[PDB]
């Protein structure tokens, strides 16, 4: 019981460390430009979209090669919930809201990426099988 | 909620349409003997 508190305290700072990631910024957009996020980028693991405070948070869709649209889990983050984050990086993102749709093309898509050997959102926090058994 | 609707037209009436047309066609062919 003594050690677990130490682990929790260390973790709840390691996450906040968050240093040493590469940020891409090469992103094109085309379509219904009214919905367009003000800034979009990716870290190699998560792709971020930032919408202004005055805009609705649309639905963001993952595109395959042939153009079929498919769901991607998303999480809202940021101080003011103005940043929507998806759990993937891809060449082509489709943004839809109501009946106006905007398409996002990634221009520097990397197939290799960064491997997930830590099992978490961080390269500094590991995940262990405490279940043992 | 609602949007575009399928009414399943063909899947509902095609049976009757095909059977009736085939029956009439066959009767006409029989009549065409002489």
């Amino acid at each position: 019981q003594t050690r677990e508190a130490n682990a929790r305290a260390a973790v709840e700072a390691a996450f906040e460390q968050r240093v040493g990631a590469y940020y891409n910024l090469k992103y094109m957009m085309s379509g219904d430009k009214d919905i367009a996020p003000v800034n979009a980028w990716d870290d190699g693991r998560f792709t971020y979209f930032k919408f202004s405070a005055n805009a609705d948070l649309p639905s963001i869709y993952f595109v395959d090669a042939e153009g079929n649209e498919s769901l991607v889990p998303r999480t809202t983050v940021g101080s003011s919930n103005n940043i929507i984050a998806v759990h993937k990086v891809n060449p082509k993102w489709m943004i839809r809201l109501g009946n106006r749709a905007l398409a996002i093309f990634n221009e520097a898509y990397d197939p290799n990426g960064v491997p997930n050997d830590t099992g978490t959102a961080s390269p500094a926090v590991r995940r262990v099988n405490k279940g043992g058994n | 909620l609602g949007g575009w609707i399928d009414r399943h037209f063909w899947e509902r009436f095609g049976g009757a349409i095909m059977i009736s047309l085939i029956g009439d066609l066959g009767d006409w062919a029989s009549r065409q003997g002489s």
Binding site: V38, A40, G78, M94, A101 | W10
Partner: peptide, 28 residues
């Protein structure tokens, strides 16, 4: 003879960058 319609496909003509300036969350 008619199926479920597809949603609108955005144009492919006007392609322009998103990030006019660096986001601040990149600490910039």
């Amino acid at each position: 003879c008619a199926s479920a319609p597809k949603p609108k496909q955005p144009s492919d003509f006007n392609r322009e960058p998103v990030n006019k300036t660096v986001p601040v969350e990149i600490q910039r």
